[PDB]
Design a protein around this ligand. Structure first.
Ligand SMILES: [Hg+2]
Ligand SMILES: [Hg+2]
Ligand SMILES: [Hg+2]
Lengths: 411, 411, 408
C-alpha cells in the first residue's frame, strides 16, 4: 500500500514516464482523451501549489523581514546579509543573461482556446505605485493582492523587531508571541508542500502527459532549453562570482570544493536547504570555520538566499512570457525578477519555491492562471521544476559555504 | 439581572412563543409578527451563523491535531477506532429514523409566493477540484465551506508533524500557533454561551412568526423531528452501546445504574465540558484506571460524532423535505458524512447541532438569505434546545461506553 | 532623525506657503498632478492601519476593562474615565457648534457637490452590526461588525483566563498576547509613517491651498481654536471641579504638572511623557503602588482627549461637504468613534485614523474627490490638534490617579 520511496525519484520517474505516455498518445493517440481524464489530475496538482502561495509568501516575509531587520541583526549578520545582496545582484544579471542567450518560449506559440493570449496592460505609474499600499491589509491577504501583501509583510516584520527592543515586557513578549505564531504557520506551510510533493509524481505525470499530447514534440526541446539555460548559469555563478569572491578573499577555490563536494551533491539530491544543513555545518567545520559563526550564518542562508531563485525566475519568467507570444524587454525582465526575488526572502528551501514564486509573479503581472494559455505554459515549467530545483538548491548551499568562508576569514 | 437556568429560559420561550404566535395566528396578525417580532428572531439567526466559520475552522485544526498520527498515543488510537465505528452506525440510524418518520412533507413552504428551487450542481470534476482552496485566506474570508474544512485538516495534521521535530525553534513555533488557534476555538464556544443567553428571546421570536404564518401543522412536524431523534437516540444506546458492552463482557444493566446521573446531567446541561467532572467521577465509580479516563473523556467531549450524526440525519432530511425537494439515500449520507466529518472537535459546544446545519446549508447551495430556506431553518432552530439535550446525553453515554471498553482492554 | 513633530509642522507651515503662492498666479493643476500624489501616498499609508489597529486594539482594550478580570482599584478609575468622556463628548460637540468650521468652503471638486446616500431601516442597520462572517467582516472593512466582534472576543478571552483548565487558560493567554503585539506592531508602523508625514502633509495642504483658495487657512484655524478652547475648558470645568470636589487644590496642582503638561504638548507621546508624569505624581505625593498602575492605563484607555477631536473634526468634515449635521447624529457618530477608540489613546495619530474609520462607517467613500479633499484638510492640521489631544490625556490621567489615590 505504502510507497516510502525517494520523493525526488518519484517525480523524475513521473516526468520521464509521463512524457513518453503523453507523446505516444499524442502521435496516433487521443490528445482529447488525455485532456478530459488525465489532465484533471494535473489540475489538482496546480491547485494544491497555488493554494500555499499566499500563506508562504506572507508568513515567510514577516519572519524573513524580522531576520534581516536592523538593529535586531547582529554585526556578524550584517556582513553576511551584505554578502547575499551583492551575490543576488549578479545572480539576477546572470539569470536574465542566460534567458537571453538561450531563447526558451519562442518556437511554441500557444493559442489553445483557438485564440492567443493578450496581456492587458497597465495602470498609470501613479496608480500602480499607490496600489502597493494595501487599503485594507486583511482584504489584501484575503483576495490575493500580491504586491500589497508583500508590502504589509515587510512593514509588519520590521515593526515586530522594534517591539522586541522595548523595555516593556508586556510589549516585548507580545511581539515574541505574534512572531512565533506567524512563524510555524510559515513552517506548517513548508511541511504541507512536502506532502504535496508526494502527490507531485502523479500530478506532474498528468501535466506533461497532456502538454506532450497536445503541444506536439517541440516542447521537449524547449524545456531542455530552459534546463540548459539554468544549469549553465548555475555553474557560471559558481565560477564567475563564488570562485572570484573566494580568490579575492585569499581562500583557495579548488580545495574549497574538495570539502563541499558531498555537501553540494547532498543538496543536489535532497532539494532541502534545511535537510542538507547538518551536512553543511559538518563541512564548515572541516574547512575550519568558528562554531559561533556557521551556527548563525548557515540557518540564515537556508532562508534568505536569493541568488538561486534569481537564476530560476530569470529563465522561467522569460520562457513563460515568450511562450505566450509576448516579447519581454530587459527593463521589464529585471522589474519582474527583482520583485520575485525580493518577495522570496525566507523562502530558500522550501522544497519547490521556484514554481510557487512563479505563480505569485503571474498573478501580480495580470496573467490569470485560469486562462487556458497561461495555465498550459505554467504547466510546462511546473513539469520540469523538480529538475531545476535540484540545481537551485545546489547553488544555494554552495553560496552559503562561500559566504560563511568569506565571513569567517574576516573574523 | 436575569440570573436564571439557561435551558429553562429557552424552553419557556419556545412553549410560550408558540402559544403567543399561534393565537396571534388564528384571528391575529401574521404580518404584525413578521414586521416587529421576527426581526428579534433574525438577530438570533445572524448571531449563530456568525460563529459558524471560526468554530468550524479553528475547531477542525485542533480536532485534526488530536486524532493526528503519530502524535496520538496507543491508548488513544483504540478509542478513536471506537468512535469511528460508533458514528458509522449513528449515521445509519440517523438516516433510517429520518426515513421511518417523515418530517418536512405536509408543510410545502413557498413564502415569497414561490417555492424554492435548488440549483444543482457542477461536474464531479469541478466539484472535487474545488475542495482545494485556491487561496486559504480567501476561502476563510468569504465562507468557502468545503475548502476551509480541507485546509483546517491539512493544517492541523501538519502542526503535529512539526511537534515531532528536533528543532525547538520549529517545535515551539507550532506549539504557539496551535495554542493560539485553540483558545480562538475556545473563545468561540464561550461566545455561543453568551448567544444562548439571547436564545430565549430569539427563539421566542422565531417560532412566534412560524406558528403565526405557517399554520398549526408545524407543531406536529416538529414533534415528528423530536420523535425521530429521540427514538434513534435510545436505539443507539440499546443496539450499539449495549451490544458493544455485552460483546466486551461488561453488564449493560449495572453500567447504566452508575451513569444514571451522568447522563441526566448531560441531558440538562447540554455541555460535554460542563458534564465532564460528573462523567470522570462515574468512570471512577465503575473502576476505570486514572490514566485512561483522564485522556479518553476529554477527547470524547470533542471528537464525538455519533450524537451529531443522529441530529444531522433527521435535521437535513426535514429541512430539505420541507422545501419540497425529495432527498435520496445517496445524497443523505453524502451530506451527513460531510457534516459529521466537519464536526470533529465540536461535540460540546452548546448548540453545535444547529450551527453545523448552517454550514451544511451554505455548502449545498441553499442561501440562508432566501425566505424559504430561512423559514425552514428557523423551525429546527426553534426546537434545537430540545434535540441538543438528547444529543449531549447520547454523547456522554457513548464516552462512558467507550472508556469502559477501552479500560477493559488495558487492565 | 530630526525631531519628528518639528518636521510635520515645518512641512505644514512651509507647504501652505508653497501651495498658496503656487495658487495665486501659479498652477493649481501642476500641484495636483505632481505634488498631490505624494500626499495621496500618505493618506493610503494611514488608511492602511485603520483596520488592524481598530480590531486588535479593541480586543486588548475590551480585555482591560473586562469584568471580573478588572480589579477593584481598576473599576473606580474606569468609572472615572466613562464620566469624563461623557463631558468631553458634550464639550466636543458644543465647541463644534459655537465655532462653525466647514461652512464658508462649499467644496464641489469634480464639478459636482457630494451627496451622502442615506440609510438602511433601523431594523436593517442594527441587524448588520452582527457580522455574518467575522473573517469577511475583517477582510473587506466592515467597520461596525469588526467593532462588535472585537469587543465580544476580548471579553470572552478574559472569561477563559478565569478557568481552572490550564490548557484553556494558557491558550487564551497566547491568543491575547498575539493579538496584542499585532496592535503594538501597528503602533510602531504609525511612528514610521509619521516619519513620512512631513513630506506627505506638505503635499496635502500644498494642493488644498493651491486649489481651494485662501479661505481654507481660516477654516482650519477655526478647527484648531474650537479644539484648543474646549481643551482648556475640559481642564477647568471638569478636571479642576473633580479635583476640588475631592478636596485637592487645583491651583497648586497645576504648579506641579506645569512641565508634565508642557512636555505632553510638545512630545505628543503619552508613553514618552510617562516618565515625566510619574515623577510629578511623586512630587504631588501619590503612593508608588498607585501611579505605577494608573498612569500606564491612562496612556492607553484615555478617551476624553479624542472625544474633543472627533466632535470638532466630524462637524467640520461634514459641514465642509455641504451636509448640515444635527446634534442627534453628531453624538451618534462621536460616541461610535469614541467607543471604538478604547485602547487607542496614544498611538501617535489616532485622531486622524479614527476619522477615516468613522467616514467609512457613515458611507462617505474616501475615494470620492470631495470626501478625500476635506479629509486632507484635517489630516494636514492633525499634528497641531494631536499635541493638545495628548496633553489633555495626560492631565486627565493625573487628575484620575489623584482622585483614585485619595480614595485609597
Ligand atoms: Hg498560482
Ligand atoms: Hg449560516
Ligand atoms: Hg480608511
Amino acid at each position: 500500500k505504502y510507497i516510502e520511496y525517494p520523493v525526488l525519484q518519484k517525480i523524475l520517474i513521473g516526468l520521464i514516464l509521463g512524457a513518453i505516455v503523453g507523446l505516444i498518445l499524442g502521435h496516433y493517440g487521443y490528445a482529447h482523451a488525455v485532456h478530459t481524464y488525465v489532465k484533471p489530475f494535473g489540475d489538482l496538482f496546480v491547485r494544491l501549489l497555488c493554494m500555499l502561495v499566499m500563506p508562504i509568501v506572507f508568513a515567510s516575509l514577516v519572519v524573513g523581514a524580522a531576520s534581516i531587520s536592523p538593529a535586531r541583526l547582529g554585526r556578524v549578520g550584517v556582513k553576511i546579509v551584505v554578502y547575499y545582496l551583492l551575490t543576488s545582484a549578479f545572480a539576477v544579471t546572470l539569470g536574465i543573461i542566460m534567458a537571453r542567450l538561450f531563447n526558451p518560449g519562442a518556437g511554441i506559440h500557444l493559442a489553445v482556446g483557438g485564440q492567443q493570449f493578450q496581456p492587458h496592460q497597465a495602470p498609470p505609474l501613479v496608480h500602480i505605485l499607490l496600489d502597493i499600499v494595501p487599503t485594507n491589509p486583511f482584504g489584501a491577504l484575503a483576495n490575493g493582492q500580491v504586491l500589497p501583501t508583500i508590502f504589509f509583510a515587510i512593514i509588519l516584520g520590521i515593526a515586530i523587531t522594534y517591539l522586541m527592543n522595548s523595555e516593556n515586557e508586556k510589549v516585548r513578549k507580545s511581539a515574541e508571541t505574534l512572531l512565533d505564531a506567524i512563524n510555524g504557520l510559515a513552517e506548517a506551510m513548508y511541511k504541507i508542500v512536502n506532502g504535496v510533493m508526494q502527490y507531485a509524481p502523479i500530478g506532474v505525470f498528468a501535466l506533461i502527459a497532456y502538454v506532450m499530447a497536445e503541444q506536439g514534440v517541440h516542447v521537449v526541446g524547449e524545456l531542455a532549453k530552459v534546463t540548459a539555460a539554468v544549469y549553465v548559469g548555475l555553474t557560471l555563478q559558481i565560477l564567475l562570482v563564488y570562485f572570484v569572491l573566494l580568490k579575492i578573499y585569499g581562500i583557495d577555490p579548488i580545495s574549497f570544493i574538495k570539502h563541499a563536494k558531498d555537501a553540494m551533491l547532498t543538496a543536489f539530491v535532497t532539494r532541502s536547504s534545511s535537510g542538507t544543513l547538518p551536512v553543511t555545518m559538518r563541512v564548515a567545520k572541516e574547512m575550519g570555520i568558528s562554531e559561533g559563526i556557521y551556527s548563525f550564518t548557515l540557518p540564515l542562508g537556508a532562508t534568505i538566499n536569493m541568488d538561486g531563485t534569481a537564476l530560476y525566475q530569470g529563465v522561467a519568467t522569460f520562457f513563460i512570457a515568450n511562450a505566450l507570444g509576448s516579447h519581454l524587454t530587459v527593463g521589464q525582465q529585471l522589474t519582474i525578477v527583482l520583485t520575485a526575488v525580493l518577495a522570496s526572502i525566507g523562502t530558500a528551501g522550501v522544497p519547490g519555491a521556484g514554481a510557487i514564486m512563479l505563480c505569485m509573479v503571474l498573478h501580480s503581472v495580470g496573467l490569470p492562471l485560469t486562462d487556458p494559455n497561461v495555465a498550459a505554459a505554467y504547466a510546462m515549467i511546473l513539469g520540469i521544476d523538480a529538475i531545476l530545483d535540484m540545481g537551485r538548491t545546489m547553488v544555494n548551499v554552495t553560496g552559503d559555504l562561500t559566504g560563511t568562508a568569506i565571513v569567517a576569514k574576516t573574523e
